[PDB]
Design a protein around this ligand. Structure first.
Ligand SMILES: CN1CCN(C(=O)c2ccc(F)c(F)c2)CC1
Ligand SMILES: CN1CCN(C(=O)c2ccc(F)c(F)c2)CC1
Lengths: 263, 263
């Protein structure tokens, strides 16, 4: 992987692995999401980091509030996928975008965008971005807007409602194992995507392909918490409303939507 | 990756990823096990496959009976690990696949693994002896003289494992596979069982020790709709005896042993 000529974006190639594919012999959405986080980490490392010097002084971290992924073609086992930046969104937080391409044809096969908010590591209290922090990362971002999802009214910015009981489908008693934890023993963001998809019926997975997924992150699941995954059909295309909540008290951890197209 | 000059073994390099490491910022044993299966698949493809032509017509497959892994140093996040793999004939009992893991920079051996494979009819699940016809079709891809990752006359890779007796000292109950735990044929990945075994090791052992050796016997497959209980008892460096069984009837699926060294 490497930063581009202007040093304002990062590119990396990945060869799709045997254990990374589903029944279609193409990468799962969870493998794509893992590759997006890997290229994001490599971009932060290449530019000097993604906590800045002022963030470490105040015990502040970047946390994901929303993830949005759109896939036109899932790369097959053995294929090479090329993934390509960050932007300041004022005092609200930051945004990270990705473009996925087939290495052989050069065509865009997917795109993703994510919203990040500033949070104190210890109290877990959200806050706005200060000017000192904002100026420290602006030298690594394009100055003009560069959007993976430019369109006037697009799916990446839609407000998601809260699923009402009873859910049409459900998967109960989901728990993270050590492989679901990151280097700081926190549940990996990609695990929640997998948990959301656990309540989609197998017949939908067998006859449709996942085109879009939008996930809001409200609260972290601790490695000792238990999760329930709920889904209701809202709709050639199928749409679903999703809700992840703590098995006991029913505390919301995530809400999302998926859009699937017939194979 | 590529076959070596004699075409009797295969080598591949991997750069350790951010999501592949544990709290010590080094690859987990599950990431190593995934890399071993990936290099094993690439070796089979490079030599024309690991189901042969007579196996395909007879509805015959290779299944893992035992996996044995020994790690001296886990590669750190961003390091390059080189893995060499080869296969060997073990008469009519079955096949063996061995691996050697090395640090790419120093060239030193950082780990080694061996696995026993048996012939099974894909449909009835009935074990079989290999027989002359299938042996002759894959002997042209194996070294003729013995090449062993674990040569020592009387080593840990060939030890008989006893069955854990109730009550277990430690346990993790209600473990279930999700879609990310399934391979391209919707079967639970072999690496998932390693993770399930490790779920019953207390966190204090993981925090103060490093996993040096793991030996796992595969007796029966977990179906994606089955529920598993993971049991562990200290037998001692620390040693543990392990048992995975179906949550309902208590049917054995796996048995194993782990050896850990103080950090
Ligand atoms: C490691 N974390 C990062 C963020 N995350 C959350 O669950 C989360 C918690 C509090 C918030 F305010 C928020 F926007 C999101 C998923 C996993
Ligand atoms: C498909 N993978 C999953 C793990 N696996 C087993 O659990 C297994 C089942 C029956 C056996 F006879 C046996 F030796 C092993 C086979 C390999």
């Amino acid at each position: 992987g490497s930063l581009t000529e202007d040093g304002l974006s990062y590119k990396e190639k990945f060869v799709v692995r045997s254990y990374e594919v589903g029944s279609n012999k193409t990468a799962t959405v969870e493998t794509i999401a893992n590759l997006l986080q890997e290229v994001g980490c490599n971009h932060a490392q290449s530019v000097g980091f993604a906590t800045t010097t002022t963030m470490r002084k105040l015990h502040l971290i970047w946390v994901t509030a929303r993830m949005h992924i759109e896939i036109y073609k899932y790369p097959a086992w053995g294929d090479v996928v090329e993934i390509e930046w960050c932007q300041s969104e004022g005092r609200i937080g930051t945004r990270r975008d990705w473009i996925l391409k087939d290495s052989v044809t050069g065509e865009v096969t997917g795109r993703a965008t994510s919203k990040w908010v500033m949070m104190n590591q210890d109290t877990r209290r959200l806050q706005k971005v200060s000017d000192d922090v904002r100026d420290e990362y602006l030298v690594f971002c394009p100055q003009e807007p560069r959007l993976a999802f430019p369109e006037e009214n697009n799916r990446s910015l839609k407000k998601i409602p809260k699923l009402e009981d009873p859910a049409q489908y459900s998967m109960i008693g989901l728990k993270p194992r050590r492989a679901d934890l990151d280097m700081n023993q926190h549940v990996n963001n990609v695990t929640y995507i997998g948990w959301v998809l656990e309540s989609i019926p197998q017949e939908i997975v067998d006859t449709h392909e996942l085109q879009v997924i939008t996930l809001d992150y409200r609260r972290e699941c601790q490695q000792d918490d238990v999760v329930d995954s709920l889904t209701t059909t809202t709709s050639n295309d199928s749409q679903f409303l999703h809700l992840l909540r703590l098995s006991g008290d029913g505390q919301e951890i995530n809400r999302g939507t998926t859009l699937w197209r017939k194979k």
